[PDB]
Amino acid sequence: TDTRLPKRRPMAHPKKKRFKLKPPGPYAYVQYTPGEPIASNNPNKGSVKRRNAKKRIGQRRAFILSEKKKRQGLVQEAKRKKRIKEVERKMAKVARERAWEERLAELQRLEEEKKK
Amino acid sequence: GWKAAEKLIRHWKILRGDNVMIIRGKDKGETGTVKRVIRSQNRVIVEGKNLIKKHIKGGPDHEGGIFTVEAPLHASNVQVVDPVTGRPCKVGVKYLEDGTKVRVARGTGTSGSIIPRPEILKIRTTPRPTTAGPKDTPMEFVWEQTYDAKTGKGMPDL
Amino acid sequence: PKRTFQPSTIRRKRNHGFFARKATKGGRRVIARRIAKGRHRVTA
Amino acid sequence: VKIAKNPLEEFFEFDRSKPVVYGRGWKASELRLKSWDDLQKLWYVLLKEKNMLMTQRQMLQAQNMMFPNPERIPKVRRSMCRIKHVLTERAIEEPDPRRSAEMKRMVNGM
Amino acid sequence: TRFAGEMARGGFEIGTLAYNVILDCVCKLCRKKDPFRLQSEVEKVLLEMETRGVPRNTKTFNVLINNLSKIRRTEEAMELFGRMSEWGCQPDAETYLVLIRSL
Amino acid sequence: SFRRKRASSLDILSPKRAPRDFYKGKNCKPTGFHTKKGGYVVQPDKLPNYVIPDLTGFKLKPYVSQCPIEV
RNA sequence: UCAGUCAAUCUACGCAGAGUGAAUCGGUCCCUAAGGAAACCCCGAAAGGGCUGCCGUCCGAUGGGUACACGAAAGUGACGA
RNA sequence: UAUUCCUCAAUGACCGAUAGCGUACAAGUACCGUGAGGGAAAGGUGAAAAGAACCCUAUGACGGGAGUGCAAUAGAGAACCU
RNA sequence: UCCAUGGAUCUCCGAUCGGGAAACCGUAUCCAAGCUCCGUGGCUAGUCUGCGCUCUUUGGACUUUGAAAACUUAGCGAACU
Ligand SMILES: [K+]
Ligand SMILES: [K+]
Ligand SMILES: [K+]
Ligand SMILES: [K+]
Ligand SMILES: [Mg+2]
Ligand SMILES: [Mg+2]
Ligand SMILES: [Mg+2]
Ligand SMILES: [Mg+2]
Ligand SMILES: [Mg+2]
Ligand SMILES: [Mg+2]
Ligand SMILES: [Mg+2]
Ligand SMILES: [Mg+2]
Ligand SMILES: [Mg+2]
Ligand SMILES: [Mg+2]
Ligand SMILES: [Mg+2]
Ligand SMILES: [Mg+2]
Ligand SMILES: [Mg+2]
Ligand SMILES: [Mg+2]
Ligand SMILES: [Mg+2]
Ligand SMILES: [Mg+2]
Ligand SMILES: [Mg+2]
Ligand SMILES: [Mg+2]
Ligand SMILES: [Mg+2]
Ligand SMILES: [Mg+2]
Ligand SMILES: [Mg+2]
Ligand SMILES: [Mg+2]
């Protein structure tokens, strides 16, 4: 029961360009304010400019931010692994000292058994 | 080195199942039955004759050893035995009363008797299966006629 | 150093392509001579 | 298993067990006994079988395994060709021009 | 559909004549706009009939047979005609005439 | 199946081996029309409809039985 | 086995199998530049060469565009260092 | 009367693998050049694959035996007659 | 299997419906007739008639000739030597 109409296909016949739609003759009939200088160009609220250029600017800004985030993530992950290695090194120090206590006890007491 | 410009034999007077005598080669003077005809080489295999020895290396599937099998003989090296005299003979073409080609013995010293077509030829090498498979339609379903042009039974959805 | 061949696909098709040859009488003679010799590559 | 539980399992041979045997292709004289509805149903049965067979060949050759009974594919292919020939025969013998054109369009449409 | 909903929420139950009219309207709209949608829409209207406990009569089968025959689906109309006794309905002259013209 | 071709057929232009604005296509049937904003409107009248019957309860199978029948 | 400046177990190397998922990315599509070509017309032993307009067509991005179709004496799109 | 993009049949004190067509072999290919264009090389185990099971030594048999075959330096994988 | 004859199917470029980086893209041509089905409108309402499309048949409207070695007949016409 939908009453909406389908989008229609564009026609392929040639259309007149706007220069040929103007009447021939020397005069141009431009918009004129009776106390103001005649403007060379009268843009309105639809006169939008540089749409592709702004799209490219936004794309470049997004690329810069994304590459920065990638770089920061890689740096942070490597510093995390470095901190883990520092903690493991500090643990291995005291494990090494205790193991040397055990080994020195074993060697000096083997010599003590040689003494008895 | 198959160096000869040998043409194919197009209509064979030498058939599978024929009783022949080897008339040329190492096994000259020996009789046998034609096990197989190799048409692409103009050669035949006579059962138990022209034996070779193959050194087959056993893989995971077959078995190794030195095996004795028949080697092919050229089709001009064998000759159909005359059914009366028992001697090798040439083969002629005789048309019967109905008009069917038959082979007859030909040559001086032959009986001219009909050389019969071997009975082994009518037997299928790949026999028909005993049990139909799960995707095989039974023949009673195949024969069910659901179309009739005269009464318009089975027309499409026009 | 910089060498003579600097590849560009669209320039190759615009100079030596099939329809580039078909556009001139000399190019059509090139195609006919080319087929008469039996080359597999009629146009570049 | 016996029956495919979902549409994905219709791309697999659920009946494959004892060497399984497969019959021959349909003959044109046997297809000339069948109605248009039966012939269309048989066309789609053959189409699903052909899809399953090519799926099995593609799966096995992706793992460097041999595809067993490769003659099953041309049997189905030739049966489908004979079905379309029989239907085109029926289209040609139709005396009405509009019905003949519609039957030809139904057969050859893609 | 909105008026049927309003009358069901007002107190009146909806009957077989109204379901026959909705089924006919659905079938005609399907045949005008998209005829390959006809079978699920018919299935939905019929399932609304057996959910509400409203039984089918001869007019329901007449509507279905007439609408199937106008897109030349004669085999479905014949299969539906053969099963009219299972819903307890019996064919009348309109069913026979529509099926003879379609055959 | 592997099949022999001419080596010269590798010189035919393909969009996989082309500049990014070269379009060829694969003989797919159109489903609508291009718009002049770079879009595409699919028209359902150009879409395929597949009439496929229900296959449950059907007795005919892909192959015909080869069992010995009668003389 | 070849290749790799090797006696290589490795590999951009040989065999085999696999892998690239888009309404929005890039294209296609619409629009035109430089330029190219038809038509009409002009010129020329032939082949061809010119002309793109006073009413005029089709291509051609390195640029302008992103949720119908048709029309226009409305604005514009629209720009340097 | 002229000619051969072609067909059929036949002939040669014509050539016989650096010869004869550029090509006896998947050649106007490979390869070279932006392009027009230029343009190769490469025939033969044995009658028949019977193409050497098995053993020994090497990482690995193409080796040494064994066996096949008239013959095995007749043992090759676009190549083994002399 | 194979043969003879007759059939069914029969992608694309070259190429001719338009565009084009050959093998791709876009394409229900247009208009008269007479016929089943289809849908909607209108009468005093029964073998009642009047408007349409889609596709089918027969025509007629636009336009598509078209390749090919040598021989032939013509136009123009060297230089080395
Ligand atoms: K002999
Ligand atoms: K040469
Ligand atoms: K020798
Ligand atoms: K001179
Ligand atoms: Mg020989
Ligand atoms: Mg080149
Ligand atoms: Mg087809
Ligand atoms: Mg091919
Ligand atoms: Mg690519
Ligand atoms: Mg296409
Ligand atoms: Mg190396
Ligand atoms: Mg690799
Ligand atoms: Mg985009
Ligand atoms: Mg311009
Ligand atoms: Mg110009
Ligand atoms: Mg001109
Ligand atoms: Mg053009
Ligand atoms: Mg344009
Ligand atoms: Mg661009
Ligand atoms: Mg600008
Ligand atoms: Mg040589
Ligand atoms: Mg020599
Ligand atoms: Mg030579
Ligand atoms: Mg060896
Ligand atoms: Mg010799
Ligand atoms: Mg075209």
Distance CA F12, CA C41 (A): 10
Class of residue E80 by CB neighbours under 10 A (exposed 0-12, middle 13-18, buried 19+): middle
Q: Is the CB of F4 under 7 A from strand H?
A: yes
Class of residue B78 by CB neighbours under 10 A (exposed 0-12, middle 13-18, buried 19+): buried
The nucleotides of chain H lying under 7 Å from a protein CB are 22, 26-31, 33-39, 44-54, 66-70
Distance CA E95, CA E65 (A): 7
What is the CA C37 to C1' I66 distance in angstroms? 22
Token pair, residue E19, equals: 């379901």
Distance CA E4, CA E22 (A): 10
Cβ atoms within 10 Å of B138's Cβ, excluding its own: 14
**Is residue B140 less than 8 Å (CB to CB) from chain F?**
no
**Partners of residue C40 in chain F, C-beta under 8 Å:** 6-8
Strand F63-64 relative to strand B136-137: parallel, antiparallel, unpaired?
parallel
Ligand 18 mean position to B6 CA, how many Å? 67
Q: Which amino acid is at B97?
A: E
Distance CA E36, CA B145 (A): 31
Is residue E31 a contact partner of residue E37, using CB atoms and an 8 Å limit?
A: no
Q: Which nucleotide is nearest to C42 (CA to C1')?
A: I22
Is residue C18 a contact partner of residue C42, using CB atoms and an 8 Å limit?
A: yes
Distance CA B144, CA D29 (A): 12
Is residue D54 a contact partner of residue D73, using CB atoms and an 8 Å limit?
A: yes
Strand partners of residue B91 = B105
- Which of residues 8-27 of A have CB within 7 Å of strand G? 8-11, 13-18, 20-24
Distance CA C36, CA C30 (A): 10
Non-local (6+) Cβ contacts of F47 within 8 A are: F31
Nearest CB among D15, D23, D106 relative to B156 is that of D106
Distance CA E42, CA E48 (A): 10
Distance CA D32, CA D42 (A): 13
Distance CA A27, CA C40 (A): 64
Q: Is the CB of B56 under 7 A from strand H?
A: yes
Distance CA D46, CA D72 (A): 11
Distance CA E58, CA E87 (A): 10
**Is residue F55 less than 8 Å (CB to CB) from chain B?**
no
- Closest-CA residue of chain F to B137: F64
**Is residue D105 less than 8 Å (CB to CB) from chain F?**
no
Smallest CA–CA separation between C43 and chain F, in Å? Answer: 10
Quick one: CA dihedral F50, F54, F59, F65, positive or negative? Answer: positive
Phi and psi, residue A34, nearest 5°: -65, -15
Cα angle B42, B46, B47 (rounded to 5 degrees) comes to: 150
What is the CA C2 to C1' H55 distance in angstroms? 66
The technique by which this structure was obtained is cryo-EM
- Which of residues 1-44 of C have CB within 7 Å of strand H? 4-5, 12, 15-16, 30, 33-34, 37-41, 43-44
- Closest-CA residue of chain C to F5: C40
Smallest CA–CA separation between B119 and chain F, in Å? Answer: 18
Nearest CB among F59, F64, F66 relative to B129 is that of F66
Question: By C-alpha distance, which of E63, E57, E79 is closest to E26?
Answer: E63
Distance CA B14, CA B20 (A): 9
> Which residues of chain B form beta strands (DSSP E)?
19-22, 31-38, 43-46, 51-56, 65-70, 73-74, 78-80, 90-95, 101-106, 114-115, 136-137
Distance CA F24, CA F16 (A): 10
Cβ distance B135 to F62 less than 8 Å, yes or no, reads yes
**Helices E16-33 and E38-52: crossing angle, nearest 10°?**
170
Q: Which nucleotide is nearest to D62 (CA to C1')?
A: G17
> Which uninterrupted H or E stretch holds E61?
helix E58-69
Is residue B80 a contact partner of residue B91, using CB atoms and an 8 Å limit?
A: yes
- Kindly compute the dihedral angle of the four CA atoms of residues A42, A45, A48, A54, in this order, to the nearest 10 degrees: 130
Distance CA B97, CA A24 (A): 104
Cβ distance F18 to C9 less than 8 Å, yes or no, reads yes
Q: Which nucleotide is nearest to F8 (CA to C1')?
A: H29
Is residue B155 a contact partner of residue D39, using CB atoms and an 8 Å limit?
A: no
**DSSP symbols for A50-72:** -HHHHHHHHHHHHHHHHHHHHHH
Cβ distance B128 to F68 less than 8 Å, yes or no, reads yes
Is residue D22 a contact partner of residue D75, using CB atoms and an 8 Å limit?
A: yes
Is residue D39 a contact partner of residue D79, using CB atoms and an 8 Å limit?
A: no
Distance CA E35, CA E41 (A): 10
Token pair, residue D3, equals: 């029956």
